[PDB]
Amino acid sequence: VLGYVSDMHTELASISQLVIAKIETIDNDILNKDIVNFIMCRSNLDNPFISFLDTVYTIIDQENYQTELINSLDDNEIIDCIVNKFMSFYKDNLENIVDAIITLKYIMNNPDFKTTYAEVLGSRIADIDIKQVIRENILQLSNDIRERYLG
């Protein structure tokens, strides 16, 4: 659309390499604000991890389906989803963390659920510390995403 030179295999390889090259230059508090902003559809694509997330979101390409699905959920089901996905931030699996962030973005794409839950999500994301889990796992996760979603 705007800003991919080549295919998504190249894009994922290249952006995952940029994340590993730059993740030490990004302060944790700034990383977490950038994650919140991505979830709320105010991406800063200059943060390579947020460019990674945006690329993965685009590759998955399920925004319309997940919107319809999330519309069918009640508040109890959404609370369950939020609590379930949030715990990934405290664990050592990056794939789950990336899934959590993207799921939260889908949920914040629903204006009722954004109104109810955006403040608490912003407050709790501020307390996470995921830089080591990104470092340790991003290259592999890039390969796993290529294998699963691309040709």
Numbering used by the authors: 13 to 163
Task: Cite, word for word, the article reporting this structure.
VACV protein A49 prevents translocation of NF-κB to the nucleus by sequestering cellular β-TrCP, a protein required for the degradation of the inhibitor of κB. Unexpectedly, the structure showed that A49 possesses a Bcl-2-like fold despite not sharing sequence identity with known cellular or poxvirus Bcl-2 family proteins. Strikingly, despite a lack of sequence conservation with known family members, A49 adopts the Bcl-2 family protein fold comprising five α-helices wrapped around a central helix, α5 (45). The A49 structure shows that A49 lacks a surface groove compatible with binding BH3 peptides and is unable to bind the proapoptotic proteins Bax or Bak.
